[PDB]
Amino acid sequence: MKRTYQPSKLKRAKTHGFLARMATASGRKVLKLRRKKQRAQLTVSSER
Amino acid sequence: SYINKPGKTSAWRVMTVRQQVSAVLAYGKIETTLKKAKNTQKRLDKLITLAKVDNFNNRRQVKKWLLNTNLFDVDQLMDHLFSKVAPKYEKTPGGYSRVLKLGPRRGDATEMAILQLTD
Amino acid sequence: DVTNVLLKPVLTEKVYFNQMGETKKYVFVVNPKASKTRVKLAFELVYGIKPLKVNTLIRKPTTIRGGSRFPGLSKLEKLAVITLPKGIAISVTGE
Amino acid sequence: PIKKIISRSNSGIHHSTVIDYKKLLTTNKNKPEKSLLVTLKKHGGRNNQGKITVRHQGGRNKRKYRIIDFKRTHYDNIEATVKSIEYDPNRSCFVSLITYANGAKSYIISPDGIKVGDKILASEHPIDIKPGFSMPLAFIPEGTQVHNIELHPKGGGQIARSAGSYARILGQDETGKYVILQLLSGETRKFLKECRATVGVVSNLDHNLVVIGKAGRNRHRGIRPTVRGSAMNPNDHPHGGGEGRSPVGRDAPRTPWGKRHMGVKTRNMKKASTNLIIRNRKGEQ
RNA sequence: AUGAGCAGGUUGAAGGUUGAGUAACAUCAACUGGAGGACCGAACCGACUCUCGUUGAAACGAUAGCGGAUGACUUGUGAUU
RNA sequence: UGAGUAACGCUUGGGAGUGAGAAUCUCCCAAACCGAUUGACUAAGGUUUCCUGGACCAGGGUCGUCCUUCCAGGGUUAGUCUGGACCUAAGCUGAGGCUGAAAAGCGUAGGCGAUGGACAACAGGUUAAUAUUCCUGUACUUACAGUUAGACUGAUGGAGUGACAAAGAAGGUUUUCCACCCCCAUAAUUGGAUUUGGGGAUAAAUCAUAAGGUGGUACAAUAGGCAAAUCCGUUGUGCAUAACAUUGAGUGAUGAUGUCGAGUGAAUGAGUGAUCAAGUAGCGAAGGUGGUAUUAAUCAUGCUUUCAAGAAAAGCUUCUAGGGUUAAUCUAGCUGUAACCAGUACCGAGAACGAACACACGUAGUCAAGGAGAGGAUCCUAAGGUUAGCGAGUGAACUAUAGCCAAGGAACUCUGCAAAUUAACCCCGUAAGUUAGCGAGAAGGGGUGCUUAUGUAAAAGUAAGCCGCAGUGAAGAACGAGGGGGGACUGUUUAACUAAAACACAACUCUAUGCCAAACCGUAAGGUGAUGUAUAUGGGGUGACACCUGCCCAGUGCUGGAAGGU
Ligand SMILES: [Mg+2]
Ligand SMILES: [Mg+2]
Ligand SMILES: [Mg+2]
Ligand SMILES: [Mg+2]
Ligand SMILES: [Mg+2]
Ligand SMILES: [Mg+2]
Ligand SMILES: [Mg+2]
Ligand SMILES: [Mg+2]
Ligand SMILES: [Mg+2]
Ligand SMILES: [Mg+2]
Ligand SMILES: [Mg+2]
Ligand SMILES: [Mg+2]
Ligand SMILES: [Mg+2]
Ligand SMILES: [Mg+2]
Ligand SMILES: [Mg+2]
Ligand SMILES: [Mg+2]
Ligand SMILES: [Mg+2]
Ligand SMILES: [Mg+2]
Ligand SMILES: [Mg+2]
Ligand SMILES: [Mg+2]
Ligand SMILES: [Mg+2]
Ligand SMILES: [Mg+2]
Ligand SMILES: [Mg+2]
Ligand SMILES: [Mg+2]
Ligand SMILES: [Mg+2]
Ligand SMILES: [Mg+2]
Ligand SMILES: [Mg+2]
Ligand SMILES: [Mg+2]
Ligand SMILES: [Mg+2]
Ligand SMILES: [Mg+2]
Ligand SMILES: [Mg+2]
Ligand SMILES: [Mg+2]
Ligand SMILES: [Mg+2]
Ligand SMILES: [Mg+2]
Ligand SMILES: [Mg+2]
Ligand SMILES: [Mg+2]
Ligand SMILES: [Mg+2]
Ligand SMILES: [Mg+2]
Ligand SMILES: [Mg+2]
Ligand SMILES: [Mg+2]
Ligand SMILES: [Mg+2]
Ligand SMILES: [Mg+2]
Ligand SMILES: [Mg+2]
Ligand SMILES: [Mg+2]
Ligand SMILES: [Mg+2]
Ligand SMILES: [Mg+2]
Ligand SMILES: [Mg+2]
Ligand SMILES: [Mg+2]
Ligand SMILES: [Mg+2]
Ligand SMILES: [Mg+2]
Ligand SMILES: [Mg+2]
Ligand SMILES: [Mg+2]
Ligand SMILES: [Mg+2]
Ligand SMILES: [Mg+2]
Ligand SMILES: [Mg+2]
């Protein structure tokens, strides 16, 4: 059956990418908390 | 339970005896399971006794059992059987083949058996 | 010009297959930020014979030594395939 | 006139009817003039926020907007000639490709009764009472049909633009302006003296009698299924809930958003245009 | 918004041409024409029934039948509420 | 503990070899399934899973010397392919600006944004792994400079083209296919063989010729195209069976003394031999005639009909503006120089993707063989591919899947649920009712095989004869009649217990709405309605078609109203 996650290189980068998070005040706040938690994968851009 | 394997159907059984009988006639020895060797012996002996007259009717009868092997085709196996093997058993009152038991297989523990032509 | 875009020559089965039969093909590794024109210019100023054409390869980094206690990634390579004209064969070592 | 459609497809029976489009249109083929052709983007009943605003809209076919000269004031004093009457998918009334003497082309709402080769001319003088001639309301004798009425003088056409729409002149006012106009739906208004209008009735008078025969024809026209309020849940509509077919239940029918809407008047009487209305289809003012 | 798909086979509308007919219409006959939310039936879409499965092969399916299948159709990509 | 219990998730036999150990690894011969697919090319995704050698800690539902696992090394070549350096659709962003306690929302000019438009390369070979990319052969395109000859050059702007729907049927040319012919191998001990089997090819590009398709052609006046116009548009005249302009599948010649080609087939070396080596290198013949009442591809962005009336921009052509005149620019030819960035491996799924699993699920497009067949249905196979990653026995009860069952034939059961009958083609025949369209494949019947002859282009059919219990001998094909309830119908719906009488639908009616319209999203700007105008829009109710829709204005709701009381 058609499961929920259908991978797409564009949709992922354009929805949860660094530039997408850096376009609104809310996105800056989420990124600040993830830097506070020192997440190695800050966003989905750094896939590798 | 469904989508089961086809299984040991009657057609599969006839083909298995046919395949084994062609090989034992070509080479002279077969290493199979005991319960399979005990079933190919009947067909092997029956084929040999009917092939003692060497007429064209008997060739058509034998051809319903022989199959192509590595060492012989279906037409030289005919010559090998009717000119080399069968003439040897010209006055033996049956019992041209022997089945003896080997050890158990390492991975199955089934009882192996060697089927050979008794000289 | 600065000649940091010629890092290291590489010798494999493919390289030696090309490096025989009249026109020779020499495969080097170059700066991943360098362009074909820079590769031709570097070869001009440090060897002296004009390349006939240049081909480029990008080998993506991949995981190496997988399952080892500390896994590591590969290194980004740009490969350049220079082909010198008929009858000329210069040595990569010895100047 | 209208022409019936005999489907003879044995899936229900539908006495569908369509406009002839053969003896009323010059060429049956679709060959619009390229210059005055812009494409329309289907909003789908959604505003700039992307939220559905007017329900039951969406799914129409692709159309190209025909630029219509509602103002008809730029090329005044220049004789124009109708060349062909064609079909416009964005309005019920037919549109005529007219050409002016200087060589300019334009589209106008086609008055009924004109054929290929009938001369047209608009300006702000007496001119002549001929069908399609557009002049200001000061010079129109009382009694003639007029369509494409202009509300703001020097503006563009706004009133009586649909198929078979017209208006009558009912004298003047003592003010020296506000010529009387009897419009459709039995309403009398006072239109400014300088306002410009075109005489004649709009074509396609038989657009009432067209009968759709199928759901698909209406869906392709751009209408989505309208769900009744009685079939809804007790949420999303006042007339919902119930166990089976239930009546209104309230004191009066209500909108989906919860107002009475039945018989109540929803006109803002404190408008600058109230004083220019004589009757409102029911009574005085 | 922009693209793509519906193997194959039937029924033979409106309209048009000709002839008869009419004072002229109407009407009838032959030929042409190929319309239909038309018909049978694969891919495709959907999920009406029995059985099996219910710690499954599977957090909803399998076999055998079943409905639609040129359209209010199916679907890919992109956007949006 | 359950318990060494359930389970181990669709595929066989043998010979030889390696190895300490082999049903499971390698090779060979068969065998069984797929064959509108388990075959081949790719998009998306996956991200080294691809090739070679080695290993058998762990993973593989068993084993393992083996693996998509692990270790080491290696592998992805572009002026022409897919995308940028070109263009825009929905939409996004958006200096100023508008709106808003703040954060922010809306939005103009600009800028992004393919799933679309424009743009120059084809054939063969080569490595274990790449190939329109490397090599060979033959080409093409765009820039820059010099040069020769000709010409006045003409855009950031105007105009034309680009530029387009659905369905259907005719043609033209190549094909598929048929017949003949050419070439290659074969001549058969099982009864008779006088034959059997296979192949018959060549591209882009250049030149010439093109069946046709599309649309009238020149001349003259012009006030219109943010200025200008010789271009466009408009108005006249002449000629208009044609001319002129543009486009065009195919054909012939080079490309090709090339390549491919059925088949024939080594040497060298490894090895104990066979065998590998390899069926590899190399060699490599013919490489054609006619028809078609059969086929698919193209011309074709062609034509006809219908209403639901069917993208934008870039680019190309043209027009002047604007620049030249002792020049620049453009065109054609020659010579030379240059052509950037990213992807290119492999899988593409009963084992590499989305489902936690080497999970019976799901995933766009493209190529589509033979026989019979309308068919891409159905059965068997071709090219090709796999051995369903636990086996061997036995044939108890019992279960699942199938097959069959004498006499009766729904007596079973809540109910003919399920199962069973019919089934393809051809020839007869076909009622009540009706909105005259239907009902209807109504109901009910008959024939089908093989041979000879007659029929045809091929048939179909016709006549005679023969065989069997049975002749679309197997596979795939509708069970029917009658009465009633509801819904007019086709459709839609509770992903994963309810597909229905429910929803919707064409139709009827009421009500509001004169345009800065009513209604609606927001707080507002702004926007939908609508680039619409009462033959229009929104809401309530009813739900084809036909006939009807009665009484009550006391209460409630709605509309209007003089004054008077609060
Ligand atoms: Mg069988
Ligand atoms: Mg590259
Ligand atoms: Mg345009
Ligand atoms: Mg509505
Ligand atoms: Mg309900
Ligand atoms: Mg409520
Ligand atoms: Mg209620
Ligand atoms: Mg009730
Ligand atoms: Mg249908
Ligand atoms: Mg426990
Ligand atoms: Mg235990
Ligand atoms: Mg127990
Ligand atoms: Mg037990
Ligand atoms: Mg068990
Ligand atoms: Mg298994
Ligand atoms: Mg097995
Ligand atoms: Mg098969
Ligand atoms: Mg496949
Ligand atoms: Mg890995
Ligand atoms: Mg490997
Ligand atoms: Mg290995
Ligand atoms: Mg193990
Ligand atoms: Mg090249
Ligand atoms: Mg762009
Ligand atoms: Mg694209
Ligand atoms: Mg490969
Ligand atoms: Mg013989
Ligand atoms: Mg001007
Ligand atoms: Mg590849
Ligand atoms: Mg699958
Ligand atoms: Mg997976
Ligand atoms: Mg498996
Ligand atoms: Mg697919
Ligand atoms: Mg086939
Ligand atoms: Mg099939
Ligand atoms: Mg039977
Ligand atoms: Mg029997
Ligand atoms: Mg019985
Ligand atoms: Mg009976
Ligand atoms: Mg009983
Ligand atoms: Mg009973
Ligand atoms: Mg049943
Ligand atoms: Mg009936
Ligand atoms: Mg009754
Ligand atoms: Mg129904
Ligand atoms: Mg239905
Ligand atoms: Mg459900
Ligand atoms: Mg259900
Ligand atoms: Mg407002
Ligand atoms: Mg608007
Ligand atoms: Mg409406
Ligand atoms: Mg109702
Ligand atoms: Mg009712
Ligand atoms: Mg009263
Ligand atoms: Mg009141």
Author numbering:
A (entry chain 0): 1 to 48
B (entry chain m): 2 to 120
C (entry chain s): 2 to 96
D (entry chain a): 2 to 286
Paper text:
Chloramphenicol (Cm) is a well-studied ribosomal peptidyl transferase center (PTC) binder and growing evidence suggests that its inhibitory action depends on the sequence of the nascent peptide. Here, we use cryo-electron tomography to analyze the impact of Cm inside the bacterium Mycoplasma pneumoniae. By resolving the Cm-bound ribosomes to 3.0 Å, we elucidate Cm’s coordination with natural nascent peptides and transfer RNAs in the PTC. We find that Cm leads to the accumulation of a number of translation elongation states, indicating ongoing futile accommodation cycles, and to extensive ribosome collisions.
Surprisingly, in approximately one third of all 70S ribosomes, we identified a second copy of the small ribosomal protein S4 bound to the LSU (hereafter called S4LSU). The conformation of this additional S4LSU differs from that of the canonical S4 in the SSU or S4 in the RNA polymerase antitermination complex. The S4LSU binding site is located on helices 12, 13 and 18 of 23S rRNA, a site that has not been previously reported as a factor association site in bacterial ribosomes and is far away (about 200 Å) from S4’s canonical binding site near the mRNA entry channel. The flexible N-terminal domain (NTD) of S4LSU (residues 1–30) protrudes into a cavity located below 23S rRNA helix 18 and contacts protein L28. The outer perimeter of the cavity is formed by 23S rRNA helix 15, which is similar to that in Bacillus subtilis in length and conformation but is missing in E. coli. Ribosomes with the S4LSU showed no obvious difference in their distribution across translational states or polysome association compared to the overall 70S population. In fact, we found S4LSU in both 70S and free 50S after focused classification of the untreated M. pneumoniae ribosomes, with similar occurrence frequency and overall structure. S4LSU, thus, appears to naturally occur in M. pneumoniae ribosomes, while its function remains elusive (Discussion). In light of the diverse roles of S4 in regulating RNA folding, we hypothesize that S4LSU can serve as a chaperone in 50S folding and assembly. The S4LSU binding site appears to be structurally conserved in many bacterial ribosomes and it may, therefore, serve common yet unknown functions across bacteria.
